[PDB]
Design an enzyme around this catalytic site. Structure first.
Site, short mmCIF file in Angstrom:
data_model
loop_
_atom_site.label_atom_id
_atom_site.label_comp_id
_atom_site.label_asym_id
_atom_site.label_seq_id
_atom_site.Cartn_x
_atom_site.Cartn_y
_atom_site.Cartn_z
N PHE A 19 -35.01 35.37 60.33
CA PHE A 19 -34.62 34.70 59.13
C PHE A 19 -33.69 35.31 58.24
O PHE A 19 -32.48 34.98 57.97
CB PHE A 19 -35.99 34.43 58.42
CG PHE A 19 -36.02 34.10 56.94
CD1 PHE A 19 -35.35 32.89 56.78
CD2 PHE A 19 -36.90 34.62 56.13
CE1 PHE A 19 -35.32 32.76 55.42
CE2 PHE A 19 -36.96 34.19 54.79
CZ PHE A 19 -35.90 33.33 54.37
N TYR A 58 -48.53 46.94 59.90
CA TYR A 58 -47.21 46.72 59.57
C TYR A 58 -46.73 47.34 58.29
O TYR A 58 -45.83 47.65 57.92
CB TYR A 58 -47.10 45.18 59.48
CG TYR A 58 -46.18 44.37 58.84
CD1 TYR A 58 -44.77 44.17 59.36
CD2 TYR A 58 -46.29 44.11 57.35
CE1 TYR A 58 -43.93 43.57 59.02
CE2 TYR A 58 -44.95 43.39 56.91
CZ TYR A 58 -43.92 43.29 57.62
OH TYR A 58 -42.96 42.46 56.93
N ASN A 70 -42.68 38.08 49.71
CA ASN A 70 -42.84 36.61 50.05
C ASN A 70 -41.41 35.74 49.90
O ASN A 70 -41.18 35.00 48.83
CB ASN A 70 -43.81 35.86 49.00
CG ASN A 70 -45.25 36.32 49.32
OD1 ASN A 70 -46.15 35.94 49.60
ND2 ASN A 70 -45.62 37.69 48.32
N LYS A 98 -40.27 31.20 62.53
CA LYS A 98 -41.05 32.22 62.30
C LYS A 98 -42.58 31.85 62.83
O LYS A 98 -43.52 32.61 62.40
CB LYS A 98 -41.13 32.95 61.13
CG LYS A 98 -39.54 33.78 60.84
CD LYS A 98 -39.72 34.25 59.51
CE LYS A 98 -40.65 35.58 59.53
NZ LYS A 98 -40.73 36.49 58.23
N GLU A 141 -59.32 28.99 48.92
CA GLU A 141 -60.07 29.17 47.78
C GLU A 141 -59.41 28.80 46.70
O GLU A 141 -58.57 29.51 46.02
CB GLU A 141 -60.65 30.38 47.60
CG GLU A 141 -60.57 31.29 48.99
CD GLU A 141 -61.78 30.92 49.85
OE1 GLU A 141 -63.06 30.87 49.83
OE2 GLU A 141 -61.48 31.12 51.20
N1 LIG Z 1 -41.39 37.39 53.26
C1 LIG Z 1 -40.44 37.94 54.25
O1 LIG Z 1 -39.74 37.16 54.91
C2 LIG Z 1 -40.77 39.27 54.30
C3 LIG Z 1 -41.25 39.92 53.39
C4 LIG Z 1 -41.56 41.62 53.61
C5 LIG Z 1 -40.73 42.02 54.38
N2 LIG Z 1 -39.97 41.45 55.35
C6 LIG Z 1 -39.10 42.08 56.34
O2 LIG Z 1 -37.63 41.49 56.21
C7 LIG Z 1 -36.96 41.84 57.34
C8 LIG Z 1 -36.72 40.70 58.16
O3 LIG Z 1 -37.87 39.72 58.21
P1 LIG Z 1 -37.67 38.36 58.66
O4 LIG Z 1 -38.30 37.06 57.89
O5 LIG Z 1 -36.08 38.36 59.31
O6 LIG Z 1 -38.51 38.31 60.14
P2 LIG Z 1 -38.20 37.82 61.58
O7 LIG Z 1 -39.30 37.21 62.37
O8 LIG Z 1 -37.03 36.91 61.62
O9 LIG Z 1 -37.67 39.14 62.26
C9 LIG Z 1 -36.31 39.51 61.99
C10 LIG Z 1 -35.69 39.68 63.63
O10 LIG Z 1 -36.21 41.16 64.22
C11 LIG Z 1 -36.09 41.07 65.42
N3 LIG Z 1 -36.36 42.07 66.48
C12 LIG Z 1 -37.94 42.27 66.51
N4 LIG Z 1 -38.14 43.12 67.49
C13 LIG Z 1 -36.90 43.67 67.71
C14 LIG Z 1 -36.42 44.44 68.59
N5 LIG Z 1 -37.29 45.26 69.33
N6 LIG Z 1 -35.14 44.64 68.79
C15 LIG Z 1 -34.06 43.90 68.20
N7 LIG Z 1 -34.43 43.23 67.51
C16 LIG Z 1 -36.00 42.77 67.36
C17 LIG Z 1 -36.94 39.65 65.71
O11 LIG Z 1 -36.60 38.95 66.92
C18 LIG Z 1 -36.05 38.65 64.39
O12 LIG Z 1 -34.78 38.10 65.14
C19 LIG Z 1 -38.23 42.96 58.21
O13 LIG Z 1 -37.84 44.19 58.12
C20 LIG Z 1 -39.48 42.23 57.56
O14 LIG Z 1 -40.35 43.09 57.75
C21 LIG Z 1 -39.86 40.14 55.24
#
Ligand SMILES: NC(=O)c1ccc[n+]([C@@H]2O[C@H](COP(=O)([O-])OP(=O)(O)OC[C@H]3O[C@@H](n4cnc5c(N)ncnc54)[C@H](O)[C@@H]3O)[C@@H](O)[C@H]2O)c1
Ligand SMILES: NC(=O)c1ccc[n+]([C@@H]2O[C@H](COP(=O)([O-])OP(=O)(O)OC[C@H]3O[C@@H](n4cnc5c(N)ncnc54)[C@H](O)[C@@H]3O)[C@@H](O)[C@H]2O)c1
Ligand SMILES: NC(=O)c1ccc[n+]([C@@H]2O[C@H](COP(=O)([O-])OP(=O)(O)OC[C@H]3O[C@@H](n4cnc5c(N)ncnc54)[C@H](O)[C@@H]3O)[C@@H](O)[C@H]2O)c1
Ligand SMILES: NC(=O)c1ccc[n+]([C@@H]2O[C@H](COP(=O)([O-])OP(=O)(O)OC[C@H]3O[C@@H](n4cnc5c(N)ncnc54)[C@H](O)[C@@H]3O)[C@@H](O)[C@H]2O)c1
Ligand SMILES: NC(=O)c1ccc[n+]([C@@H]2O[C@H](COP(=O)([O-])OP(=O)(O)OC[C@H]3O[C@@H](n4cnc5c(N)ncnc54)[C@H](O)[C@@H]3O)[C@@H](O)[C@H]2O)c1
Lengths: 310, 311, 310, 314, 310
Positions: free
Chosen positions: D21, D154, D181, D190, D214
């Site tokens: 994302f 996490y 969020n 996702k 709720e």
């Molecule tokens: N609301 C949100 O989207 C939210 C909230 C809080 C924190 N975050 C953080 O934002 C960042 C990105 O979140 P996101 O929304 O892109 O989720 P996402 O599901 O898109 O994960 C990002 C990427 O990480 C890749 N990945 C996972 N394991 C891997 C590995 N071993 N090697 C290489 N790539 C790997 C996944 O394939 C995906 O492409 C993170 O660090 C996530 O925890 C997101």
């Protein structure tokens, strides 16, 4: 009881398969008889079949342990850090589940050659356990150099060990010991592969009845664990490589056990159901000053108290 | 409460099994009492059996973490990059699923030796956790050096740790600590292997009924997590290697727990169901480490109980 | 019987697949005929399909063994420690379970290339086993260089071996030997893939009845294990690389076996149920002084006593 | 829209989790706004749970890709061959199947430390994604440094990342970004863990009915993917390490989404469901503004508005 | 037929995926047209899905083989020992079982980059196979640089290959070739993923009936395997990196195949059941001197004799 008047003062003794029957007994002998020597026991430690080593066999051990698998390169590489003066290679595979032929060779022979290499570099004398199994079903008495026709991989693997040290008799002082039906303390955890004296003695003490194949009058050279021990310690004074038979050099029938057993445990049932070994011990005596004590009687006698631990 | 008047100002403290019961408690002690020291916690972190470490036990930790498996060569090799002054080795296997004998030895002993090697090279003092399990079912009081007849691999593995440091007492300052039935905060996630005080106290608070084997009058030397902590910090001032018993040196029956428990939680059912006795000989520990346990089963259950109320 | 008047005095001979049919026979030939040469046998040793090597085929071997898997980098790396003068590469996969195409290539070809590399560095002459399978279902006689259209991976893998040494004929002296339906002592443990002479002779001796496909008059060039041995030892005097056919150069029907068999074992049942090879041996004779003895008759005759071991 | 007037002319930008994302959106931003910079995206690429990265999120990407698993030593070792000026660490595990505690730590923390080491040696600035999950169920507003009590591994793992860079604030310039969020384009893959605005808007557009727990009046600080992007690019000009909250700093209820949603998609059913059970987030954004010049645009309204066209791609 | 008047005299040509369709055909072209060049074919060799390479496609190959998996570090490390002047990267995963997204990227892209690195170090020109799949369902004609919106991982992976060489156009001379529905000899073993001309022609020759989706009038740019070959050999004279479309640049419906097919195989049943590609070939012609021969007619004509091998 000392088998050599050497103090072994600052010597480090490495015993592989130390959590097993002979290895553990051997480790204790040095512990009690040569308290100045450093006794380090190495073992994979019971994987459950396969390795039947067990910490129970080391309950009173004050020396040190090395949790290792002789087939694991990393463990062997780490083992090179240890400076040892002697190597008693007792570690091998349990004939019980000796299914795969390739694997028996790996751990019983391949793994062995590697330890040989490490010992040679460390210029540490090697004393290893072979087997009377190298003779297969050939005419007794069993003489080293004659009629070694294994019938199973396990026996063959042991033969390979000997054929190797004989081919490399000058690489280092390497002494092979072919054991014949050993019995005595600490063989209990070998489970179904524990000596018949342990087997019979237990059936008698328990079910007061004992099973035994076709008349059970087949002869085996039963050697008490103590004589096997004498052999290993005598062997560490060898100034030349060689492989020796190590038994009592006197065959006895399974019935004579039942007999010497009744003479102790009283009477019991002898239910039936439907090979001959005798160690030619001459060269062993000649070269290692080996002189077995304990006939089946003295053996069963000394062993029996422990067997009572039920 | 400081157990040594040392500031531990620029010292780095490495605690393995830091996501577990004693390790996490220990990490917090240093955090709160020696704020100048660097507390680094290392743990595999709950694999699901096996490792029962849990991040919940580190909820208020402001120090740093190292996600590592002590059996993993790569992780250990990476650990050598870290410069630490002390190593509190608390990481070991959960007796709960201690099935395979070879594996208990790998992580409880083999893995230990390697940490010993790394600490020695870094000339970092070593304080490790052993167990009262090394005594097996022998006559109490349990004295170090006497009647150490383990009954299970786990107990044996611990004995091997001690038999090794004793054989290598001069390689570095290595202090083994034989704990006896420890109880206190942060043992909840040990699941079914959590202390009986935690077990009983929970059954009482929940089902208002508590099960207990054959009369539950068997004696165990219950030592409060706080005294175990005192032992570790006192141990880091040791100028010589050694292995010590660490308990309250006073055996108590499972019934006395139920009792001290009713005296708090009111009354509850005592259902039963149908051969060991431990009591730490603590003299040498006192003599050598200045160890002086506070907290009897009463003071212990008292101090612990508020946390147990977190339901 | 010596096939070359060379003593092979201080030579080290490495035989891979030594626990198998031809490898074990070959190791024994050197043992008995060139007692001065060092014979070292290498084998994975029966993994159970896959490797059908068996210690039973080495029962009287006094030389040395190497428990190794030619696909294992560590084993190969360890093998470089050994100084050998000749390499007889007999190790390969059992066509019986030759399921996966990638795997046959790995052990039959990829593993081979690595041994080639090791031998070349050690400047050790190479003599390897190919197969008549390289011809697939093409018109007989089968001539090296013509109509090599394998029908299965196993046959193809062998072809690649040859196409490689031919492309690298000057890297070292490498001699390929294309065997055609070999039979003789020590092929028993190849189980269901053992020669038809062994198959028929056993069915006859046992069930006194023998099964055989569509009239069983299809021709195969049956070469006795002894001629195959002659071929390997003659090949070690080759001063140039090359691949040769090694058969008796005379096709015989499965019926002629049944015949020559009845002429010995008396009569038996010939129950039925519903390719042609003949080695063009000219260049082999020309280059290796190869001269096969043992026709199906002399072969079945000499072999039969062993087959009696039931 | 440029968030910094820097050309990033000969800079190489490494974005881990680039098939995901925020990573993919981020990669596109640089592609379109700083066409002179080299954008290299790294990702494991959807293993099926676990990694939910997906090539669909990179459909118009003209830069380059690196198929790699940050936990794989060989891949990391090969990664050292690459010379990059910036590292935006977005790669992490999907909370969806975050079952094993040991494994979340491995990839979310252990793997991170190694990237930190590689970036430090390459003297490449580090900007990483943390989470508002570090606060667990504590009183809002959520302030960095206060009440960070994770409730799951996490969240804890993310906290460890921050506690580490804070302890090593001078090893290199490392900037942690705690997202709250996030919603916006490219979060579809996702799956079940896609934003509620995406969830609701989809239920409404499909079944014309939407479920919601709720009363669904619980507040979350919803920050649009664009502001998250502004945060990362602003973060790359930081001359000091630090961890910042990055949200809109204004909590909104799931109902307000449904509302702003009806105001667009017309009316639809609002079915509830029941099953302490409380959480409330609102980013204290002061330090972020102060240090990174962060200034969020897009309230839930401007956000849902801008996002909605893409959601229509059904 | 030579496509370049270069002898390629002492050149070593490495073809990955050489046991596959285009790779094997390519290997034979060099074998027959540039007999002086060293042709070495590399392939995993059919793992059974996954790799659909097959020794049958190399039946008349006199060059050499390398049994290797491009994802295997050890194999790649061993590959560095080989000195080659050109690398034709044809090895990739079968879209048939392209299930896991991460794995397609590993072997189709990650493994590719490593080969790029090895070729660059060896300063060996690189010519690799991309796909028209990079365009997904976009408006035809398909122009390189425009509307490359893959619809599946396989297509994306190929796109990544190109986006990489384009970003690294000066690291070495690397030429990407985007094939469009290739057909011709040696595609049979691709099983269900073999060309429609092979599919239809076989259904017609067998069941005398042929199935075909919704009116089967959808257009595909069918390029004969021979033109693909021309493209690869012309590409090895490129002095600059680049990615080119390689098709006949003329779309044809599945019906026109059925038609051109009936015109040969006589009539047959046309049972139904219920995307548009056309290569913009200008730059390819301009840069590689590419000039496709073989329209669907000339292609189906030339191919058909082989299809008769039933
Ligand atoms: N609301 C949100 O989207 C939210 C909230 C809080 C924190 N975050 C953080 O934002 C960042 C990105 O979140 P996101 O929304 O892109 O989720 P996402 O599901 O898109 O994960 C990002 C990427 O990480 C890749 N990945 C996972 N394991 C891997 C590995 N071993 N090697 C290489 N790539 C790997 C996944 O394939 C995906 O492409 C993170 O660090 C996530 O925890 C997101
Ligand atoms: N009747 C007999 O007792 C007899 C007869 C002939 C030969 N021998 C030989 O004497 C020696 C000792 O036999 P034993 O009676 O002690 O059997 P045992 O099984 O009781 O002891 C052998 C030890 O080897 C250990 N071991 C197995 N695999 C290992 C590995 N990979 N790495 C490290 N350790 C491993 C086992 O755990 C066991 O503790 C052997 O070499 C055995 O073949 C014994
Ligand atoms: N009653 C008691 O609490 C008691 C009694 C006797 C001995 N001990 C000893 O105290 C020490 C800790 O006991 P505890 O109560 O904390 O148990 P625990 O279950 O909390 O174990 C501590 C930690 O070890 C970690 N761990 C296990 N294997 C690991 C590995 N391979 N790598 C990294 N981390 C790993 C677990 O995750 C856990 O967090 C041990 O050495 C234990 O044997 C405790
Ligand atoms: N027997 C025939 O008539 C015949 C016909 C054509 C070709 N050949 C070839 O002659 C050679 C020998 O055939 P054979 O009759 O001895 O077959 P065999 O299977 O009896 O002997 C082959 C030996 O190779 C060993 N081996 C297999 N894989 C190994 C590995 N990875 N590492 C080490 N050893 C391994 C096997 O265990 C076996 O001991 C082969 O190359 C075979 O294909 C034989
Ligand atoms: N044939 C077409 O219609 C077409 C169209 C577009 C693109 N392409 C591309 O052309 C090239 C060849 O296609 P093809 O038609 O010959 O398919 P193919 O499957 O016949 O050839 C691919 C070869 O790669 C080999 N291979 C797969 N994985 C391997 C690995 N890990 N290591 C080593 N070798 C491995 C396979 O065994 C096979 O021999 C590919 O890059 C393919 O994507 C083909």
């Amino acid at each position: 009881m000392r088998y050599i008047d050497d103090e072994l003062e600052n010597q480090t003794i490495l015993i592989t398969g130390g959590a097993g029957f002979v290895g553990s007994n051997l480790a204790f002998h040095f512990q009690e008889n040569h308290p100045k020597a450093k006794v380090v026991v190495l073992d994979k430690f019971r994987s459950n079949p396969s390795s039947l080593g067990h910490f129970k066999n080391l309950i009173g051990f004050k020396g040190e342990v090395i949790a290792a698998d002789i087939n694991n390169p990393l463990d062997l590489r780490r083992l090179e850090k240890l400076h040892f003066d002697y190597l008693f290679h007792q570690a091998a595979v349990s004939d019980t589940t000796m299914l795969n032929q390739e694997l028996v060779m790996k751990t019983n022979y391949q793994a062995f050659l590697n330890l040989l290499e490490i010992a040679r570099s460390k210029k540490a004398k090697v004393i290893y356990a072979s087997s009377a199994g190298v003779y297969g079903n050939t005419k007794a008495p069993n003489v080293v150099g004659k009629n070694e026709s294994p019938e199973n991989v396990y026996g063959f693997s042991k033969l390979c060990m000997d054929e190797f040290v004989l081919s490399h008799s000058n690489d280092n002082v390497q002494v092979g010991l072919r054991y014949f039906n050993v019995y005595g303390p600490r063989e209990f955890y070998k489970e179904k592969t524990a000596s018949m004296v342990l087997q019979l003695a237990l059936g008698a003490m328990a079910f007061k009845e004992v099973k035994l194949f076709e008349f059970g009058e087949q002869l085996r050279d039963f050697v008490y664990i103590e004589d096997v021990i004498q052999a290993n310690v005598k062997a560490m004074k060898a100034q030349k490589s060689g492989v020796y038979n190590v038994g009592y050099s006197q065959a006895r029938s399974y019935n004579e056990i039942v007999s010497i057993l009744k003479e102790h445990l009283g009477d019991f049932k002898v239910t039936y159901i439907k090979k001959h070994t005798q160690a030619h011990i001459e060269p062993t005596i000649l070269d290692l000053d080996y002189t077995p004590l304990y006939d089946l009687e003295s053996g069963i006698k000394d062993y029996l108290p422990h067997i009572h631990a039920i």
